[PDB]
Amino acid sequence: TVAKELRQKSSEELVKLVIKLKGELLEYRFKLAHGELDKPHLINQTRRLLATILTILTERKLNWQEEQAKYKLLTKKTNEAAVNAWKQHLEANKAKLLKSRAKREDASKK
Amino acid sequence: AKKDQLTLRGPLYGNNRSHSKTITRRKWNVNLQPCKVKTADGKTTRILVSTRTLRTLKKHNRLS
């Protein structure tokens, strides 16, 4: 039944499905580890659908990681706060670095 | 091993019978001797063969 529907799907759409279900599986396991999973069966359903998609994808001589490595889309959103924190941290590091060499230099000059 | 290189004939194990018919296991070894056999004017390997095989080679004009 389900295997027929996935067979109708193309290959690229199938690899999009597998990466999305991998992400959802990670989220389900994390929520379970935080005691926030009301529906504890979706983990099993996700795994079975993941296994089925792998079977259809392995009928044809195609992998799931390499095919997605060939073409993909980059990331977004998780950039602003990251660069703010990193810019602040490297600025602080350079200030400490500048202060230390100066102290040493003026000490050696004296 | 103490065996021929052309054939595979090796030692012969038997009994060492003496007076009073006392039994002691003994081994007969083949008369291994070194010989050089030419082959198409080359590769004159110093093989270790028995005297029987040496006689066979001699009567065969050194053919093996």
Binding site: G23, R29, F30, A33, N79, A82, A85, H89 | -
Partner: protein
């Protein structure tokens, strides 16, 4: 890459003591065969903020339920302590 090396976050007294006060330290359990560099890459590909450094713990298996009719051993755990830079604190649940 496959992101099977981030099994489960863990919350204890030690974890919450560290997870406060400017730099946050988040402790997860990871694949025992994974390395520090793989842990940083997984956090990059699944969270988006580069860890400042990673520390690893190996907890050896030990006997549990001793004296019970059927005794059993523990499971091998590798713990990873990620520390994000100053002023950033992301949530382990909610994406």
């Amino acid at each position: 890459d496959v992101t099977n090396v981030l099994l489960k976050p863990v919350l204890t007294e030690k974890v919450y003591f560290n997870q406060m006060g400017e730099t946050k330290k988040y402790v997860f359990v990871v694949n025992p065969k994974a390395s520090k560099t793989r842990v940083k890459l997984a956090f990059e590909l699944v969270y988006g903020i580069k860890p400042l450094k990673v520390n690893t713990l190996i907890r050896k298996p030990t006997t549990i339920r001793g004296g019970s009719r059927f005794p059993g051993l523990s499971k091998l755990e590798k713990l990873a302590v990620i520390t994000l830079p100053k002023g950033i604190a992301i949530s382990v649940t909610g994406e």
